[PDB]
């Protein structure tokens, strides 16, 4: 469980194969049905192919009323014109800025976390190397004490 | 700015008092009708507890080539295709994520076993060097 | 804070802590021994009296119950920290007794280094001498070995000498210092011993049942001597982590056992620092200097 | 966030392991010099 | 969970990577003696 990421700077394929062998050891309404049938089926539902072609008298008068409604809907667009587009474009940029602000916040918090872990690991690996050196010297000391005790037994 | 169920831009945003997050009135009411609790926190919430918000009346520019034909034929069809294939891709990714989670948990248990073996190896090697 | 203490009329040569870490003892030319409380405002309660010569070295026992103090007037003195009063005047020294050391955790026994040419062993109860190893010359510092069975001494001939209390011969003589050794202090390891010598070098040695036969371990640079030839004394930290030294350069030198780096050359003093004292509990430093006052540094 | 909680939980555990391995050898040093003390004491007895 | 698990997996992989060489050094240590 314990693993010094910051201290261990220095085989992964070997341990990977060893882990590989050790693991080798061991809600919607009908809308959902129609959507899944249309997806598995894939064939998109039939749309309105009546209005454009123009039985034909009604469709024709429909094209008339619809072309009049369309020619009216293009008047209220040109009346204001390019002001309404940039009026929402300013809003687009204003909504854009907050996102990068929060991105900066997140980078900063993660960086502070990694900085804390860095110092923690730096204390810990140092204690570890000091303990290892003391262990080596203690092994050598037991060895020398053994040689001296044997010689003392010789007398 | 957004709704916290539908991922939309709400036209009548309403915020809850137990978990302060802006939801669309329609989805929030449907959620309250399904089960009477907050979606996010799963805390007790009713329709009467919700408090509607007032906003900038936010506008969408209908395309210049907007008619009954293009709205009826092409637009709704594009919307239904973008719904179906996106839901299908999300389901596929969910299945794949479950499979990857399974492979990750197995690999983790294998690493645990290997580490448990090396803990018994290394310490006794150290004792034998001490011997 | 810096906490400089004053109230001494002439140089203070020796300052050391209660082995409790409760009370402070300092002494020097003024022929009396001042005491203080280490905490609070570092305040002065008691003053011990009597020593006609200069108090050249004060030394505690290892509990803190009686006080040993080597005087210039041919005498050592043991007193009651309970009272401050004399129990024994170790007379008989034929010259300037500069150094004193009470045996720790053994029978009550004292080794005193003097300017007569002898090291003297004394029992407190008998009013008589135990042993005396007349090598040839003045011995300037003396400390026991934690078995209370060897005795180490440093003088003018630069070869640190150690006697066995039972065979009474020069047990261990060590060499390598270029000029006179002025201070010995064996760490609380019971093993590592620290040696100041005015040749500008400090050394570390280790008295063991078995040593490499040439036990000159660690070496640090920095100490100074001059026309003063004042007596310079060293100490280990309670932990054997930092060595503290003084010198005639007005700089408190704090080094480490580990990397032998210069952790500190601290200014602040006016005259030569003669003795640095480590708190047995805290990171508290007390400097006794020849500027007739003391410092209480916190690190 | 879970990486630090798993790191800081076992950071003392990686330290707590070598703490004994030093002290287990550290106590072995005392007994080492204890016999080494007895080893020099009798050498003079046989030298005498 | 996938991200945390992959991270901890490589982390604990380094644990065995170090321990293996530790045993490896200890083996030659005891073998030479």
UniProtKB/Swiss-Prot annotation, chain A:
Ranges in coiled-coil conformation: 88-155
Gene name of the record: BCAS2
Pfam families attached to this UniProt entry: BCAS2
Organism phylogeny: Eukaryota, Metazoa, Chordata, Craniata, Vertebrata
Primary localisation category: nucleus
Keyword vocabulary terms for this entry: Acetylation, Coiled coil, mRNA processing, mRNA splicing, Nucleus, Phosphoprotein, Spliceosome
Subunit structure: Component of the pre-catalytic and catalytic spliceosome complexes. Component of the postcatalytic spliceosome P complex. Component of the PRP19-CDC5L splicing complex composed of a core complex comprising a homotetramer of PRPF19, CDC5L, PLRG1 and BCAS2, and at least three less stably associated proteins CTNNBL1, CWC15 and HSPA8. Interacts directly in the complex with PRPF19, CDC5L and PLRG1.
Consequence of changing residue 89 to S: In a colorectal cancer sample; somatic mutation
Entry comment describing in which tissues the protein is expressed: Ubiquitously expressed.
Protein's job: Required for pre-mRNA splicing as component of the activated spliceosome. Component of the PRP19-CDC5L complex that forms an integral part of the spliceosome and is required for activating pre-mRNA splicing. May have a scaffolding role in the spliceosome assembly as it contacts all other components of the core complex. The PRP19-CDC5L complex may also play a role in the response to DNA damage (DDR).
Family: Belongs to the SPF27 family.
Name this protein carries in UniProt: Pre-mRNA-splicing factor SPF27
A GO CC term assigned to this protein in UniProt: catalytic step 2 spliceosome
Location within or outside the cell: Nucleus; Nucleus, Nucleolus
UniProtKB/Swiss-Prot annotation, chain B:
N6-acetyllysine PTM sites in chain numbering: 120
Location in the cell: Nucleus; Nucleus, Nucleoplasm; Cytoplasm, Cytoskeleton, Spindle; Cytoplasm
Induction: By gamma irradiation and chemical mutagens but not by UV irradiation.
Coiled-coil positions: none
Residue ranges of domain U-box in the record: 1-71
Tissue spec: Ubiquitous. Weakly expressed in senescent cells of different tissue origins. Highly expressed in tumor cell lines.
Domain note: The 7 WD repeats are necessary and sufficient to support interaction with the RPA complex.
Subunit composition and interactions: Homotetramer. Component of activated, catalytic and post-catalytic spliceosomes. Component of the Prp19 complex/PRP19C/Nineteen complex/NTC and related complexes described as PRP19-CDC5L splicing complex and PSO4 complex. A homotetramer of PRPF19, CDC5L, PLRG1 and BCAS2 constitute the core of those complexes. The interaction with CDC5L, PLRG1 and BCAS2 is direct within this core complex. At least three less stably associated proteins CTNNBL1, CWC15 and HSPA8 are found in the Prp19 complex.
Assigned protein family: Belongs to the WD repeat PRP19 family.
Name assigned to this protein: Pre-mRNA-processing factor 19
Gene field: PRPF19
Residues represented out of the complete protein: 3 to 133 of 504
Curated annotation (Swiss-Prot), chain C:
UniProt main location, coarse: nucleus
Repeat region (WD), residues: 7-46, 50-89, 92-132, 134-173, 176-215, 226-265, 268-299
Molecular function terms, GO-annotated: RNA binding
Crosslink (Glycyl lysine isopeptide (Lys-Gly) (interchain with G-Cter in SUMO2)) position: 213
This protein's record includes keyword Nucleus: yes
Annotated GO CC locations: catalytic step 2 spliceosome; cytosol; nuclear speck; nucleoplasm; nucleus; sno(s)RNA-containing ribonucleoprotein complex; U2-type catalytic step 2 spliceosome; U4/U6 x U5 tri-snRNP complex
Ranges in a coiled coil: none
Keyword list, A-Z: Isopeptide bond, Methylation, mRNA processing, mRNA splicing, Nucleus, Repeat, Spliceosome, Ubl conjugation, WD repeat
UniProt key word Nucleus: yes
Biological-process GO terms, alphabetical: mRNA splicing, via spliceosome; RNA processing; RNA splicing; RNA splicing, via transesterification reactions
Subcellular location(s) per record: Nucleus
Function as written in the Swiss-Prot or TrEMBL entry: Required for pre-mRNA splicing as component of the activated spliceosome. Component of the U5 small nuclear ribonucleoprotein (snRNP) complex and the U4/U6-U5 tri-snRNP complex, building blocks of the spliceosome. As a component of the minor spliceosome, involved in the splicing of U12-type introns in pre-mRNAs.
Protein name: U5 small nuclear ribonucleoprotein 40 kDa protein
Species for this entry: Homo sapiens
Swiss-Prot record, chain D:
Domain of life, source organism: Eukaryota
PTM summary: Phosphorylated on serine and threonine residues. Has no effect on subcellular location nor on homodimerization. Phosphorylated in vitro by CDK2. Phosphorylation enhances interaction with PPP1R8.
Coiled-coil regions, chain positions: 12-48
Cellular location(s): Nucleus; Nucleus speckle; Cytoplasm
Tissue and organ expression note: Ubiquitously expressed in both fetal and adult tissues.
Function noted in UniProt: DNA-binding protein involved in cell cycle control. May act as a transcription activator. Plays a role in pre-mRNA splicing as core component of precatalytic, catalytic and postcatalytic spliceosomal complexes. Component of the PRP19-CDC5L complex that forms an integral part of the spliceosome and is required for activating pre-mRNA splicing. The PRP19-CDC5L complex may also play a role in the response to DNA damage (DDR). As a component of the minor spliceosome, involved in the splicing of U12-type introns in pre-mRNAs.
Family membership noted in the UniProt record: Belongs to the CEF1 family.
Clinical note on disease: A chromosomal aberration involving CDC5L is found in multicystic renal dysplasia. Translocation t(6;19)(p21;q13.1) with USF2.
Protein name listed in UniProt: Cell division cycle 5-like protein
Range of the intact protein held here: 753 to 800 of 802
């Amino acid at each position: 469980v314990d693993a010094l990421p910051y201290f261990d700077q220095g085989v992964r394929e070997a341990a990977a194969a060893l882990v590989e062998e050790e693991t080798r050891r061991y809600t919607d309404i009908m809308r959902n049905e129609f959507e899944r049938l249309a997806a598995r089926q894939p064939i998109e539902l039939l749309s309105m192919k009546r209005y454009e072609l123009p039985e034909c008298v009604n469709n024709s008068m429909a094209q008339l009323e619809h072309q009049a409604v369309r020619i009216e809907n293009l008047e209220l667009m040109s009346q204001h014109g390019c002001n309404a587009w940039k009026v929402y474009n300013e809003n687009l940029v204003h909504m854009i800025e907050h996102a990068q602000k929060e991105l900066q916040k997140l980078r900063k918090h993660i960086q502070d976390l990694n900085w804390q872990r860095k110092n923690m690991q730096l204390t810990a690996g140092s204690k570890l190397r000091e303990m290892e050196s003391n262990w080596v010297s203690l092994v050598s000391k037991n060895y020398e004490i053994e040689r001296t005790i044997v010689q003392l037994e010789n007398e | 700015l957004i709704c916290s169920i539908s991922n939309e831009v709400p036209e009548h945003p309403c915020v809850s008092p137990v978990s302060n997050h802006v939801y669309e009135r329609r989805l929030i009411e449907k959620y309250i009708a399904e089960n009477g609790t907050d979606p996010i926190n799963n805390q007790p919430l009713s329709e009467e507890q919700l408090i509607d918000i007032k906003v900038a009346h936010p506008i969408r520019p209908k395309p210049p080539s907007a008619t009954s034909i293009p709205a009826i034929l092409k637009a709704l069809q594009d919307e239904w295709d973008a719904v179906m294939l996106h839901s299908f891709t999300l389901r596929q990714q969910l299945q794949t994520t479950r499979q990857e989670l399974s492979h990750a948990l197995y690999q983790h248990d294998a690493a645990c076993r290997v580490i448990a073996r090396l803990t018994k190896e290394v310490t006794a090697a150290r004792e034998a060097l001490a011997t | 804070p810096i906490m400089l203490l004053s109230g001494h009329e002439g140089e203070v040569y020796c300052c050391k802590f209660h082995p409790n870490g409760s009370t402070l003892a300092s002494a020097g030319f003024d022929r009396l021994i001042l005491l203080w409380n280490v905490y609070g405002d570092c305040d002065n309660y008691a003053t011990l009296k009597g020593h006609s010569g200069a108090v050249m070295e004060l030394h505690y026992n290892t509990d803190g119950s009686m006080l040993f103090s080597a005087s210039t007037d041919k005498t050592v003195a043991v007193w009651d920290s309970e009272t401050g009063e004399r129990v024994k005047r170790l007379k008989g020294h034929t010259s300037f007794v500069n150094s004193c050391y009470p045996a720790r955790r053994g029978p009550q026994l004292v080794c005193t280094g003097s300017d007569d040419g002898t090291v003297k062993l004394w029992d407190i109860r008998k009013k008589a001498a135990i042993q005396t190893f007349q090598n040839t010359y003045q011995v300037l510092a003396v400390t026991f070995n934690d078995t209370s069975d060897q005795i180490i001494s440093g003088g003018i001939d630069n070869d640190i000498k150690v006697w066995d209390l039972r065979q009474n011969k020069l047990t261990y003589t060590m060499r390598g210092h270029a000029d006179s050794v002025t201070g010995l202090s064996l760490s609380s390891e019971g093993s590592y011993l620290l040696s100041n010598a005015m040749d500008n070098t400090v050394r570390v040695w280790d008295v063991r049942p078995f040593a490499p036969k040439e036990r000159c371990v660690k070496i640090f640079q920095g100490n100074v001597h001059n026309f003063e030839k004042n007596l310079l004394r060293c100490s280990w930290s309670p932990d054997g982590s930092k060595i503290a030294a003084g010198s005639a350069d007005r700089f408190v030198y704090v080094w480490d056992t580990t990397s032998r780096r210069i952790l500190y050359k601290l200014p602040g003093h006016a005259g030569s620092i003669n003795e640095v004292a480590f708190h047995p509990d805290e990171p508290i430093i007390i400097s006794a200097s020849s500027d007739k006052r003391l410092y209480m540094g916190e690190i | 966030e879970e990486l630090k909680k798993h790191e800081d939980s076992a950071i003392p555990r990686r330290l707590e392991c070598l703490k004994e391995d030093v002290q287990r050898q550290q106590e072995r040093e005392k007994e080492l010099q204890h016999r080494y003390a007895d080893l020099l004491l009798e050498k003079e007895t046989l030298k005498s | 969970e996938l991200s945390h698990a992959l991270y901890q997996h490589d982390a604990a992989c380094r644990v065995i990577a170090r321990l293996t060489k530790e045993v490896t050094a200890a083996r030659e240590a005891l073998a030479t003696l």
